[PDB]
mmCIF file of C-alpha atoms and ligand atoms in Angstrom:
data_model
loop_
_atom_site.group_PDB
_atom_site.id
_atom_site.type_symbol
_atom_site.label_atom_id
_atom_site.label_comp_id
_atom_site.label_asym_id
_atom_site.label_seq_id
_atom_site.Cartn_x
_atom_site.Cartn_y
_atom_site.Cartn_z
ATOM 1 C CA UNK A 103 94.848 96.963 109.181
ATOM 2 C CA UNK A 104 94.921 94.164 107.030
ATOM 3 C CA UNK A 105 99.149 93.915 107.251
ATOM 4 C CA UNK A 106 99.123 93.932 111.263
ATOM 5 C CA UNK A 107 96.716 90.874 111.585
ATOM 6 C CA UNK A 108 99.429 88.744 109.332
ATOM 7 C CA UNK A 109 102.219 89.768 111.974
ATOM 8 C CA UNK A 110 100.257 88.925 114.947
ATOM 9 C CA UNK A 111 99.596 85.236 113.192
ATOM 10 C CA UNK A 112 103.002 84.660 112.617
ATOM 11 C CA UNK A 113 104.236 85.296 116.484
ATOM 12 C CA UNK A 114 114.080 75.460 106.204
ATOM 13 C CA UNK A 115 112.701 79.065 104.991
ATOM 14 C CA UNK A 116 109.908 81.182 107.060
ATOM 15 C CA UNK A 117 109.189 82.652 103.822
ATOM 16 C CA UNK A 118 106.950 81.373 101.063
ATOM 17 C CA UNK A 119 107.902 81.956 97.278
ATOM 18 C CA UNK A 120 107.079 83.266 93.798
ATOM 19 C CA UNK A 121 104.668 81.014 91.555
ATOM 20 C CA UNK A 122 105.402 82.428 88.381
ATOM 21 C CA UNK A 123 102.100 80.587 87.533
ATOM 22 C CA UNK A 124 99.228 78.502 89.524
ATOM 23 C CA UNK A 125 100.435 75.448 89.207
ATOM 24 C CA UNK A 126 97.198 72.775 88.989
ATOM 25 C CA UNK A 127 96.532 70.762 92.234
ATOM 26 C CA UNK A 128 99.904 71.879 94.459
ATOM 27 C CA UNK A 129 98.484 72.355 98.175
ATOM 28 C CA UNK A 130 100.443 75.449 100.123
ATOM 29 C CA UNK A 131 98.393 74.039 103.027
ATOM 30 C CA UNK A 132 99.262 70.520 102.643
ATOM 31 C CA UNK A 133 102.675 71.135 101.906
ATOM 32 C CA UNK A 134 103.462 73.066 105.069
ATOM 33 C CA UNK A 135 101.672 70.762 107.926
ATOM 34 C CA UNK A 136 102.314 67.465 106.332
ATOM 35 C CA UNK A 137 105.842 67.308 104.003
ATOM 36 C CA UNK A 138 106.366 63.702 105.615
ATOM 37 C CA UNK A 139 104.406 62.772 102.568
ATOM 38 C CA UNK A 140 106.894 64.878 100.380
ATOM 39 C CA UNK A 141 104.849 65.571 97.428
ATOM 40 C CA UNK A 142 106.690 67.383 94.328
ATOM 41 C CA UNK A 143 104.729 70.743 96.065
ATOM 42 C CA UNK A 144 107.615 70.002 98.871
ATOM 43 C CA UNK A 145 110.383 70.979 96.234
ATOM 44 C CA UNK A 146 107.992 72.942 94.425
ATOM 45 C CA UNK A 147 107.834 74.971 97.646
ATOM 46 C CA UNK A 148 111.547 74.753 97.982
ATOM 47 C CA UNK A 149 112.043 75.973 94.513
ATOM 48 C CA UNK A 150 109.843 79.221 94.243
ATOM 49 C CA UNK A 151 111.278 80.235 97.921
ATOM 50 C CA UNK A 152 114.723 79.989 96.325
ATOM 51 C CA UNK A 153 113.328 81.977 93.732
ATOM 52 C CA UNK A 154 112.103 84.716 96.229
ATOM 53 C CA UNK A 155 115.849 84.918 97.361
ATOM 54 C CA UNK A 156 117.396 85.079 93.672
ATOM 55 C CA UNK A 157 114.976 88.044 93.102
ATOM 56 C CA UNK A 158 115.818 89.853 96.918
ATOM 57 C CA UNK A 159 119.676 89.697 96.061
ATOM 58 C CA UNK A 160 118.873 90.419 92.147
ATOM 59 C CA UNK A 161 121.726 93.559 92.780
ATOM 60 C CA UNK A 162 124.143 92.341 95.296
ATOM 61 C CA UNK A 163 127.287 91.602 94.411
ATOM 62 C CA UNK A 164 128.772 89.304 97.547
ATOM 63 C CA UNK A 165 131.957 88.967 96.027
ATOM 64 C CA UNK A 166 132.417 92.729 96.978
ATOM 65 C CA UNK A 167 130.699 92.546 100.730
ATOM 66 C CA UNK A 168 132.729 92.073 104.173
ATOM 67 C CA UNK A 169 130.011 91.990 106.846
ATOM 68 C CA UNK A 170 126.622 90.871 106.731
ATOM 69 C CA UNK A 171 123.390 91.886 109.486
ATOM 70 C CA UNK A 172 120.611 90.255 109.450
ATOM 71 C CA UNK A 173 118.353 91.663 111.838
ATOM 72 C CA UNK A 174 115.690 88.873 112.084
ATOM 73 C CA UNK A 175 116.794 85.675 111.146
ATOM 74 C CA UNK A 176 114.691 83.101 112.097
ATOM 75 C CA UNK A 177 116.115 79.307 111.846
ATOM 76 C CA UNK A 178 119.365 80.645 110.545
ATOM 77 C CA UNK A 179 118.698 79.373 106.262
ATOM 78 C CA UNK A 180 119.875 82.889 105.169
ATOM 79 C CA UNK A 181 123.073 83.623 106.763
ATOM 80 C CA UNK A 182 123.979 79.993 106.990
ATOM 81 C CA UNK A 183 123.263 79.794 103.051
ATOM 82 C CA UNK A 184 125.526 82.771 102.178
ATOM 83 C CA UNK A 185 128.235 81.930 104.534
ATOM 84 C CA UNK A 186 128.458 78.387 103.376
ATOM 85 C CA UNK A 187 128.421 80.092 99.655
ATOM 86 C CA UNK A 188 130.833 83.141 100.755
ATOM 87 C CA UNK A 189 133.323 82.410 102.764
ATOM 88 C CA UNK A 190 135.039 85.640 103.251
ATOM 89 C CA UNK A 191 131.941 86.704 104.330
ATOM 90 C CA UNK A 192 131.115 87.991 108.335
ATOM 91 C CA UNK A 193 127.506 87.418 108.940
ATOM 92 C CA UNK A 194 125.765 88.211 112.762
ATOM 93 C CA UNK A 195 121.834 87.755 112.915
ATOM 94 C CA UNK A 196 119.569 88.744 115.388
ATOM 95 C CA UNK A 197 116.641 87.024 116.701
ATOM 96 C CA UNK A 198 114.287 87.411 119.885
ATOM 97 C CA UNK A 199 112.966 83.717 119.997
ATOM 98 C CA UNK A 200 115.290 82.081 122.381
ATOM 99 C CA UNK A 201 114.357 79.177 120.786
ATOM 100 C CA UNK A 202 114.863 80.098 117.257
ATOM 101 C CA UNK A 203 118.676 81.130 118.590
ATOM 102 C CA UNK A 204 119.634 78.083 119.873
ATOM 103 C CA UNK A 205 118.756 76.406 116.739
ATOM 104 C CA UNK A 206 119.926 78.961 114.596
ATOM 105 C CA UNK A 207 123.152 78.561 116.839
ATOM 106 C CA UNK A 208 123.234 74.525 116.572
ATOM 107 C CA UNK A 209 122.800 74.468 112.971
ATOM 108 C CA UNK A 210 125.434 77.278 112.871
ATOM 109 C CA UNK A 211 128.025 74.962 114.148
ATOM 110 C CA UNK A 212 126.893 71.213 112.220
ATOM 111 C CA UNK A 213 127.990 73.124 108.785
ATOM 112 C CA UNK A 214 131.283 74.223 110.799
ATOM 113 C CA UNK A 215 130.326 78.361 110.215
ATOM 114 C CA UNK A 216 130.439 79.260 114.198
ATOM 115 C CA UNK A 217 133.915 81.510 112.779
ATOM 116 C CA UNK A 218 132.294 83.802 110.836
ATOM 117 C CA UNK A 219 128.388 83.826 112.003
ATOM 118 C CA UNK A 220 127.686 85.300 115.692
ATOM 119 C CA UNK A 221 123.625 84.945 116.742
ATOM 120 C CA UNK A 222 122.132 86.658 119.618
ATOM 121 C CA UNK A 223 118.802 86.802 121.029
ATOM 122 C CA UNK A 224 118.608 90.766 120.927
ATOM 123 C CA UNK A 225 115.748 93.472 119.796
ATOM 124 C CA UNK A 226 116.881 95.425 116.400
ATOM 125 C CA UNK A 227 114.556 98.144 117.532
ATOM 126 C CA UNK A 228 116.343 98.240 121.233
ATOM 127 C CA UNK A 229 119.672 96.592 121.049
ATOM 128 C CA UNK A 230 122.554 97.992 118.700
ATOM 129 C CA UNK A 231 123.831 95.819 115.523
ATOM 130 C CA UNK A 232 127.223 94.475 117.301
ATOM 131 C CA UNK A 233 129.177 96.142 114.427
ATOM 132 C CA UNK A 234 129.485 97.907 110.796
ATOM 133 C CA UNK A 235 127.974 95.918 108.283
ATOM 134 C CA UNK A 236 128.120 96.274 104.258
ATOM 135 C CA UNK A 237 124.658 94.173 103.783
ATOM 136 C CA UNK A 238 121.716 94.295 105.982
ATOM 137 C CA UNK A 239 119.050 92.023 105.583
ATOM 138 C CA UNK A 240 115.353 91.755 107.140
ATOM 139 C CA UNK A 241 113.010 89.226 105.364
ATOM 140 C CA UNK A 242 109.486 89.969 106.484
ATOM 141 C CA UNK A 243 110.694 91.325 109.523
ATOM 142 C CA UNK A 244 110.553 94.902 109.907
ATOM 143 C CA UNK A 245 106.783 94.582 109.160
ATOM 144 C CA UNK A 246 106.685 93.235 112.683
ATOM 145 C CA UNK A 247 108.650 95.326 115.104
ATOM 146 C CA UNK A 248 106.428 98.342 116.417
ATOM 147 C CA UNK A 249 109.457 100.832 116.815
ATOM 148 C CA UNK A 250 110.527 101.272 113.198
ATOM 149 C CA UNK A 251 112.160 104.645 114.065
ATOM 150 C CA UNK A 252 114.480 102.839 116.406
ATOM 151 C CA UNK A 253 115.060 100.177 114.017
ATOM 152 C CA UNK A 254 116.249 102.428 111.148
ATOM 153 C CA UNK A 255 118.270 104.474 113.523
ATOM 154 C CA UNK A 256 119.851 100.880 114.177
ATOM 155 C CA UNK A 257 120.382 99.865 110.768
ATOM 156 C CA UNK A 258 121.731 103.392 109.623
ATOM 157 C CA UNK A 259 124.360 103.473 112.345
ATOM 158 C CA UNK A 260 125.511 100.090 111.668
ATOM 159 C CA UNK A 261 125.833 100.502 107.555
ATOM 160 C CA UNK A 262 128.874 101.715 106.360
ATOM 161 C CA UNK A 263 128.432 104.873 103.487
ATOM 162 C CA UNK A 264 127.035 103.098 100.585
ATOM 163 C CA UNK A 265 125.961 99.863 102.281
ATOM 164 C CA UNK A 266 122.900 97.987 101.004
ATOM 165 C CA UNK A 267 119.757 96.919 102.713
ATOM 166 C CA UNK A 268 117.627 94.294 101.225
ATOM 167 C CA UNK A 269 113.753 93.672 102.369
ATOM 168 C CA UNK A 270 110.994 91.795 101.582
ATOM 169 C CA UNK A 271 107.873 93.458 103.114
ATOM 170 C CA UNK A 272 104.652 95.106 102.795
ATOM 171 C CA UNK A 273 102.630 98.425 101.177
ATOM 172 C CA UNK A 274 99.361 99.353 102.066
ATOM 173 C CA UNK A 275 98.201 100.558 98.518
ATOM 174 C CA UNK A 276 95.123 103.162 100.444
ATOM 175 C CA UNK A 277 100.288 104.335 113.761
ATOM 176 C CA UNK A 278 102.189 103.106 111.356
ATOM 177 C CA UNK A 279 100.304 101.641 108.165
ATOM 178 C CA UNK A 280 102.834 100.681 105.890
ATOM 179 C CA UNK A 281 102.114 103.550 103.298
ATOM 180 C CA UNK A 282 104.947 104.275 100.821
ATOM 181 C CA UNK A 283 105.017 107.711 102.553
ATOM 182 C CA UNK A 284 105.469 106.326 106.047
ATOM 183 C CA UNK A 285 107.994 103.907 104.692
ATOM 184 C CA UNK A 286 109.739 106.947 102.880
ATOM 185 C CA UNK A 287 110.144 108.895 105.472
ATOM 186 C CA UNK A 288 112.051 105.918 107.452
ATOM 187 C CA UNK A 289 114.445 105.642 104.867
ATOM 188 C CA UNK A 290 114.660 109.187 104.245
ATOM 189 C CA UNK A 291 115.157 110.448 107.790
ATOM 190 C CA UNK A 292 117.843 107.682 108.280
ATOM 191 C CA UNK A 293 120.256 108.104 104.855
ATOM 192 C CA UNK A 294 118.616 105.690 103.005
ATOM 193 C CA UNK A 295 117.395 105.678 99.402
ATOM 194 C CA UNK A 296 115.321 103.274 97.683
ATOM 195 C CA UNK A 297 117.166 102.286 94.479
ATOM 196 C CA UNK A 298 114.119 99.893 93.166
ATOM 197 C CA UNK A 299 111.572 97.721 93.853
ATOM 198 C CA UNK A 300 109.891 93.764 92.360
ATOM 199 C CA UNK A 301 106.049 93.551 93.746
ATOM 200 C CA UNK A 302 105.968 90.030 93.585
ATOM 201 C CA UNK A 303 102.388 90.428 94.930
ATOM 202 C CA UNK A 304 101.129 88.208 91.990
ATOM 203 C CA UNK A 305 103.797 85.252 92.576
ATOM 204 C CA UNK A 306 103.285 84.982 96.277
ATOM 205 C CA UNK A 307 99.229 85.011 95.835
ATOM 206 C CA UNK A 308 99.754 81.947 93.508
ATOM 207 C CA UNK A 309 101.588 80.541 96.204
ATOM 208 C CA UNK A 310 98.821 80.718 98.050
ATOM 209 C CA UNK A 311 96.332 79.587 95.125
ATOM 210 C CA UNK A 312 94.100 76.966 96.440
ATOM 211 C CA UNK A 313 90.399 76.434 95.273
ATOM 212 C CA UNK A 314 89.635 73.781 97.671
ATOM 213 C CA UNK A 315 91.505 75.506 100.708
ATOM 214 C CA UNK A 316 88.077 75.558 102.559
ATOM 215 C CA UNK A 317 87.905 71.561 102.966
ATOM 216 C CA UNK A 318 91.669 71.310 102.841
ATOM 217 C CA UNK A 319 92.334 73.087 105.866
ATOM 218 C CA UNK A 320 89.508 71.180 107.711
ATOM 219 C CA UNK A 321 91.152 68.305 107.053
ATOM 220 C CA UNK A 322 94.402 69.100 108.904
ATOM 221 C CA UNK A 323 92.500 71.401 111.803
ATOM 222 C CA UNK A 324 91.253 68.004 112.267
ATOM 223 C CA UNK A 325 94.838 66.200 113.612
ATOM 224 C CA UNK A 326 94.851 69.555 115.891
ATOM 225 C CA UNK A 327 96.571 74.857 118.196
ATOM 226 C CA UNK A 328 93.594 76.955 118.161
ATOM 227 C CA UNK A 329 96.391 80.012 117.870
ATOM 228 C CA UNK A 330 97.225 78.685 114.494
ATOM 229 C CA UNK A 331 93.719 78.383 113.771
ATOM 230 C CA UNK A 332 93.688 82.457 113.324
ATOM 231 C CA UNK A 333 96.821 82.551 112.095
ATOM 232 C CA UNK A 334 96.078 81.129 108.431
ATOM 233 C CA UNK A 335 92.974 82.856 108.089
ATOM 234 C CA UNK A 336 95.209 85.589 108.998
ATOM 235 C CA UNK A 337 97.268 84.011 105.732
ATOM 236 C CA UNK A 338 94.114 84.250 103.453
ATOM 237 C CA UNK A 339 92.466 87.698 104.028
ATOM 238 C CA UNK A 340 96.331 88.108 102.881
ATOM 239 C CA UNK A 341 95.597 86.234 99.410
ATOM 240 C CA UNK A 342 92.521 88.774 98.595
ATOM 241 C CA UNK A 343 94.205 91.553 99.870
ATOM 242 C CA UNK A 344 96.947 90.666 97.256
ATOM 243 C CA UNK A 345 94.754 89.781 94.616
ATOM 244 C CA UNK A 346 92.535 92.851 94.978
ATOM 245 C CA UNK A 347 95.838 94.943 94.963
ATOM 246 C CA UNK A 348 94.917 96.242 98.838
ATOM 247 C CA UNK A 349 98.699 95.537 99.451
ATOM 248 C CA UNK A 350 101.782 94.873 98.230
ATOM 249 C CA UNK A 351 104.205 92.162 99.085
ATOM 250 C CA UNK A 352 107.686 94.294 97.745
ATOM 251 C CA UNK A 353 111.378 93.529 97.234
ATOM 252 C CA UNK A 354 112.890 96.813 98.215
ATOM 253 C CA UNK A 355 116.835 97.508 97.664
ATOM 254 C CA UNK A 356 118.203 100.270 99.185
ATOM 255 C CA UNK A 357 121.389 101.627 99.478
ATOM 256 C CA UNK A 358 122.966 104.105 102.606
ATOM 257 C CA UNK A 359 123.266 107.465 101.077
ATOM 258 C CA UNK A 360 124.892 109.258 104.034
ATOM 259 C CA UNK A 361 126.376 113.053 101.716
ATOM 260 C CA UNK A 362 122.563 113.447 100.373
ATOM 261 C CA UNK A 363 120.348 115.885 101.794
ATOM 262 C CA UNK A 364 117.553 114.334 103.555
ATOM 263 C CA UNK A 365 114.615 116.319 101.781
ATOM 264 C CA UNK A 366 116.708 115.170 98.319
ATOM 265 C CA UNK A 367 116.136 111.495 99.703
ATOM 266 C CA UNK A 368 112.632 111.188 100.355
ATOM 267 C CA UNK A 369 111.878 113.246 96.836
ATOM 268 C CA UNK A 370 113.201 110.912 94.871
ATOM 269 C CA UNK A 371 112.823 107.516 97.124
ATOM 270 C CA UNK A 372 108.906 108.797 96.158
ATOM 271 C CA UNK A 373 109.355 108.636 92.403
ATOM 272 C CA UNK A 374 111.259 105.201 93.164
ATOM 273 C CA UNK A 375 108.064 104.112 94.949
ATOM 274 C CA UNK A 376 105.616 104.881 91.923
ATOM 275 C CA UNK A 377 107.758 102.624 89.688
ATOM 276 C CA UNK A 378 107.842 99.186 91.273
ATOM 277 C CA UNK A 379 108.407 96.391 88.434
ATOM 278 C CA UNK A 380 105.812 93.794 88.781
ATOM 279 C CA UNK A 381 107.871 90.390 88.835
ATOM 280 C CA UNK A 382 106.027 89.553 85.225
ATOM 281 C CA UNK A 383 108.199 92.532 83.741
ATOM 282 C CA UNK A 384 111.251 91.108 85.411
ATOM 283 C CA UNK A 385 114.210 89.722 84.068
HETATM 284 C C1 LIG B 103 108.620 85.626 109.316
HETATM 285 S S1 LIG B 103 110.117 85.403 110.313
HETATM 286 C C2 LIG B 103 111.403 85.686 109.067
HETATM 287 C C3 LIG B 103 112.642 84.865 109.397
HETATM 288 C C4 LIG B 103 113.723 84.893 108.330
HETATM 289 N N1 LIG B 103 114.025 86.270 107.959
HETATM 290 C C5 LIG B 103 113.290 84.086 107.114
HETATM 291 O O1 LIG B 103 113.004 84.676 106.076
HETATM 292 O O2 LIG B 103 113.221 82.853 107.128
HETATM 293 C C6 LIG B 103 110.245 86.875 111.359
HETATM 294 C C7 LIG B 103 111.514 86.884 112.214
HETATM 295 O O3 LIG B 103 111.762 88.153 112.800
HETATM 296 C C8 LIG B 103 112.173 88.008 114.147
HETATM 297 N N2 LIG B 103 111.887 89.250 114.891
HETATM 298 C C9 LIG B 103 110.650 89.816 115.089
HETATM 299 N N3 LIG B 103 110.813 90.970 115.785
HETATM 300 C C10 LIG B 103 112.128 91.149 116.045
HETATM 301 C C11 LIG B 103 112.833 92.136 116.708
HETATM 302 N N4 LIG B 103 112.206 93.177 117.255
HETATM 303 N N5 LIG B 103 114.213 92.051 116.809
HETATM 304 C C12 LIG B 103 114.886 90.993 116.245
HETATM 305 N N6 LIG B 103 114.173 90.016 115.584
HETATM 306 C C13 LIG B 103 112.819 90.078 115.484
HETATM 307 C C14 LIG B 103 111.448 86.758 114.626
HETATM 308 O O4 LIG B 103 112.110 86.215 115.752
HETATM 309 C C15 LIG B 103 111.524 85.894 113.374
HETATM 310 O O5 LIG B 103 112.791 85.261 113.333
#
């Protein structure tokens, strides 16, 4: 309900980060339409997305990975990021904005990576990861692609015995709805097992903290483009929904468990599910 009118709005970073804390006067708003007046909320911005990251990867060891998926990866920052950080790592990302792949393959090349990361416009849920992979990534992505059964399938034919998968999506705390037993029983049926879980639901809603967002957002609807009119009120039934604990906004790792039995799986990815840390208890 709530979760599916956030996807439809959103068809360096096309994710936005953990506030530990409201932080007096910084804008999300302003920050994202106008950062030619780069305020410190630009780097603050910068900061608690990087921050979002350190938390997603909190158990990954690259030093120990070969091959890298991401299956929706946007302008590129990810892959491009780790391979310029890694680089024995093998990274291929899939995206199905033709736009978003040409850039993602342009800025590819500028930082000299076009050896080791591959980018095709492709559909995770119809068109098979071009390999075995060790790390699989989807950033708010997997919240958006109607054929999750497909794109499980996917992933758990392209992860090697053991592999990791990293996400940052959402719950639905009350057709697919997002419910910790409908996510369950994709991992399950698919040899995966949730090893934990940081709601950062708090964090992200401070993000999105801002008291005067009613005149704010006038102001820039007035330099207007009526589709991303919807689109951020999409972004602030979002903030109450968070606030009010209606969803969660979760930092799932998961690991390919391919000897386990299946029923074994989703018994105990359901105990993992009751236990998410709360970022605040995090450390
Ligand atoms: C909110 S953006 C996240 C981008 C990137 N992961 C990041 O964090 O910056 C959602 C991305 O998923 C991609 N996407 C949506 N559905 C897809 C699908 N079925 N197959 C492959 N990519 C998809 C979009 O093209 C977009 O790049």
């Amino acid at each position: 309900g709530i979760i599916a009118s956030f996807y439809d709005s959103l068809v360096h970073f096309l994710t936005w980060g953990v506030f530990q804390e409201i932080v007096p006067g910084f804008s999300w708003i302003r920050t994202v339409f106008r950062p030619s007046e780069r305020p410190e909320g630009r780097e603050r911005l910068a900061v608690a997305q990087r921050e979002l990251r350190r938390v997603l990867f909190r158990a990954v060891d690259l030093s120990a990975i070969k091959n890298v998926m991401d299956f929706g990866c946007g302008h590129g920052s990810d892959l491009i990021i780790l391979g310029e950080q890694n680089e024995h790592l093998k990274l291929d990302g899939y995206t199905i904005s033709g736009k978003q792949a040409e850039v993602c393959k342009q800025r590819v090349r500028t930082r000299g990576l076009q050896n080791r990361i591959r980018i095709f416009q492709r559909d995770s849920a119809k068109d098979d990861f071009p390999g075995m992979y060790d790390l699989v990534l989807g950033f708010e992505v997997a919240g958006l692609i109607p054929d999750k059964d497909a794109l499980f399938s996917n992933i758990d034919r392209h992860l090697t015995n053991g592999g990791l998968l990293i996400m940052a999506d959402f719950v639905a705390n009350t057709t697919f709805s997002s419910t910790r037993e409908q996510w369950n029983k994709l991992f399950s049926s698919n040899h995966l097992r949730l090893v934990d879980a940081v709601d950062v639901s708090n964090e992200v809603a401070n993000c999105l903290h801002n008291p005067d967002y009613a005149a704010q957002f006038e102001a820039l609807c007035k330099e207007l483009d009526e589709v991303t009119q919807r689109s951020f009120g999409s972004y602030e039934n979002v903030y109450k929904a968070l606030r009010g604990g209606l969803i969660s906004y979760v930092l799932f790792h998961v690991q390919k468990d391919r000897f386990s039995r299946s029923d074994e799986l989703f018994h105990l990815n359901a105990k993992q599910f009751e236990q998410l840390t709360p970022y605040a208890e995090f450390a």
